[PDB]
Design a protein around this nucleic acid. Sequence first.
RNA 1: AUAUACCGCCAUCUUAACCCUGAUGAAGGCUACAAAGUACGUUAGGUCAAGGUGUAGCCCAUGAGGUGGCAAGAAAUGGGCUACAUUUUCUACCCCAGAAAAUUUAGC
Lengths: 128, 292, 126, 110, 33
Amino acid sequence: LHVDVPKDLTKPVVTISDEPDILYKRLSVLVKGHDKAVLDSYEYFAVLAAKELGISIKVHEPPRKIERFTVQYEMRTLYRCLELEHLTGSTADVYLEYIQRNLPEGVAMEVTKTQLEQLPEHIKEPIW
Amino acid sequence: TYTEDFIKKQIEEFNIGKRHLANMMGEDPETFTQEDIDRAIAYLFPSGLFEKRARPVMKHPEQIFPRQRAIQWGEDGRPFHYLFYTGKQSYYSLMHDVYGMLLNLEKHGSRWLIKEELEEMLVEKLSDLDYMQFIRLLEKLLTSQCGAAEEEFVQRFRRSVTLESKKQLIEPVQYDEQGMAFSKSEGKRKTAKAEAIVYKHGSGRIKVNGIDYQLYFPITQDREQLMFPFHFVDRLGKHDVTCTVSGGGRSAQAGAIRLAMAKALCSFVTEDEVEWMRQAGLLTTDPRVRER
Amino acid sequence: RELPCAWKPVTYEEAHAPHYIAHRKGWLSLHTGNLDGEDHAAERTVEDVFLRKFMWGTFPGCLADQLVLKRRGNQLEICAVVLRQLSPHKYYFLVGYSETLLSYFYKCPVRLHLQTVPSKVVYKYL
Amino acid sequence: LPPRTEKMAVDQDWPSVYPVAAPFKPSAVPLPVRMGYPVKKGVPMAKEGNLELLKIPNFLHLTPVAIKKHCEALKDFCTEWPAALDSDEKCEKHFPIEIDSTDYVSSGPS
Amino acid sequence: ADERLRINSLRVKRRWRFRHLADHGQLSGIQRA
RNA sequence: AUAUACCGCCAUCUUAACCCUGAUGAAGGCUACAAAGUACGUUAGGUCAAGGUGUAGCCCAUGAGGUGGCAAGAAAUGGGCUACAUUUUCUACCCCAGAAAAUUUAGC
Ligand SMILES: [Mg+2]
C-alpha cells in the first residue's frame, strides 16, 4: 500500500487485572517431528520470538527414536527442547499461543510448566 | 535443449529472485550471497530428505543448466584457436606448451591428476593413451631442473594428499606450585579412561587413585603392563606417576594407564625415543571394542 | 507377437519407487498421529482414505496429481492439483460444496487449496 | 492468466503477501526455487505444478521481518519477572513448592 | 458391559487398523528401512 | 468348513545416423612413435493365537445328556531338556587364605 493506508487501527483490549500473576520458574517445550529441517526452522522461529519478547531461552536436542516394525517399515521421531526460564503467566500465555498457532503440520508439542507456589497457611504451623 | 535466450531469461529471473529473497530475509541485497541463499532456502523451505540434491535449491542458472556449449568460432566462421581443427584444441595446446617448456629446459605426498578430472579441467573428452602421453610429458618436466614457473605449472596438475604420521603431539611440560616439572596425558581402553601425570624427576612411585600400584593391581600381568613403557626407554625408577583411572575392568584399566603414561612420558624423552615408542605400539589407542 | 520377440508418462510421485519416500519423495499426508506418544493414528488413516476417495469422485478427471492432506490443530487443509479443463464456475461450486460437506462430516474447519495446471506435469517416461 | 509475482515489487512488504500459514503458491511466491531429483542430463523441476514443494511445511509466513513485527505488537500482552528473584537461589527460598503440569498439542478433531 | 463387569467382580498390526498406503506415501511418518 | 472367500501379514517366482574402402559386386573399416572411422503381475502358497468383512454347513443333531471302556508294545535312527568336578566346589574376599572331595558347530 503506497497511499491507501488504514488511518487508525483498533488495538486489542488487554486489561491489567487486580489479581496477582502466576510465576513459572521453567517452561520446557518439547517439539517432536519426522523431519529435522522442519524442527530446525521451528527452533529458529521460536528462539527469535523468545529474544524479541525478552524471554530467556536455551535449546538442546534430545536423542532421536526409531520404531521399526514388519518388508521392514520404520518411523523416526526427532526432538527439539526449548527451555524458557523466569517468565510470568501472561508472558507464557502469549508466547505459547504464538508458537502453538505457528506449529507446523506434522509436529507435536509437549509444554511442561513449573509453577512457583508458596506454602499454604494451613501447613505453616502444627495444629494444637 | 536450452537456447541462449532461455538462459538469459533464467539469469535475469534469478537476479530478481535474489533481490526478492534478500527482501524477505531482511538482509542487504547488495551483499547478499549464495551461502545466504542456501541458508534462507533451507529455513523457508525446510526439507529432511536424505538426498542432498532433492532438497529445494536456488542456484545461479549456469550452475544448473549444462553450459559447456561454448562457441569456438565467430560470425565470420574463423575458429578462435589455432588448433581448432584437431578437435582437441585444449589438450593439444597443453601438450604443445609442455613440449615448448621441455625444449627451453633442454636448451638451459602428492598424486597425479586423474583422467576424469583432467577432462573436467580441459572440458574435453580424452582417451587413456593420450592421458598417459600427457602424464609422461609431465614426468619428464619434473625430472629436469624445473624452475619456479615450471614448478607451479606442474602443481596445477598435481593434487594434494596429506601424510602426517610419525608425529606424536608432545604434551607441554608444566610446573606445579612446588616448582616441579610434570606432564599430563589421557588414555582409553575399552570403557576404561585413565589420566596420568608423569613427573620429570622421581623415584619410580606409581600411585593409582591414591593407592600404590602393587595394591591397586594385585595381578602380575597388569604390573607388567604398567612397567612396559618405562622399561622400554630404560628409565625405570626415574619418574613418579600419579594417575586416575575410571570405568572398565582390570586389564582395560591397566591398558588405559599404560597408554596415558606413555603419552605423558613422550615429553621427557628424545624424539628418536618417541618414534621408537610409536613403533613399539606404545602410543596407539587400541580401537578393538565389543561388536554388537 | 512371438515368444522371444518379447525377450507411458509418469509424474514425480509415480516415477519414484516406495523406498524413496523419505529420500526423494515426501509424505502426502502430514499429521502428528504417527509420532511417538501420539494417539489416533488409525482414525487419521481412515479419514485420509475417505478424503481421497471423496475428492477423486467429486473432481473426476480434474485432479492432475495426488492430494496433499495437511493438519494443524483441528484444521484440515486439502491441497489439490487440478487441470484447467473444467470451468471456473464449476470449480467454485465444487470447492464450496466439498468444504461444507467435509466440515460437517468431520466436525472441523476443513479448507481447500486448488492449484490448476495446464496439463499433467510429466517427470519421465516408464 | 499470468502469475501475479510479475506485479510484485523488489521492495514490497512480504508479510502482507503471506500473513498466515498457507500452502506454497508458485504464482504468489516470487522465487525461482526448484525441487526434485534431476534425471540424467536434467535439472530439478520448476515450481509450477511441483508436488514436492507443495508438500513442504513452508515458513514463508514467518520471516525474520515478520517475526520481529509480530513480537513488537505482542509485547503489550506481557508482564515482568519480579527482579528480586534474580536466580534459582531465591526462587527456592521465597517459593518452596514447585508444581509441574504438562499440556500436549497434537493435530486432530479432539 | 457394566452389569457383566460387576457380577464378574463379585465372582495383524492394529495401530492403523497398509502396504498400499505405506508404499504410496499416504501414511505420515512411515518409510522403508 | 472356507483366507481352495476377500482384506491384512509373511513368503515363492517373472519383469539408429553419418563418413570412407573395394573400379560404386556379394562385402569391409584396426595399429597410440597411431595407417578412416565418429556418434506390477504370480501362487489349488502359509497364517483365524495378539486382526477384520463375508459366505456356506447340521438344526430327532455336526445340539444336550447318561452307562462302561480307552490310559498300547517293540526296535533303529532324527531332534530337544537336565547334571556331567579337581583349570572343580563352599566361605572370606574380589585374585598371596582356609576347608571339601561319526558327522556337526563356529573360525576370518
Ligand atoms: Mg491358502
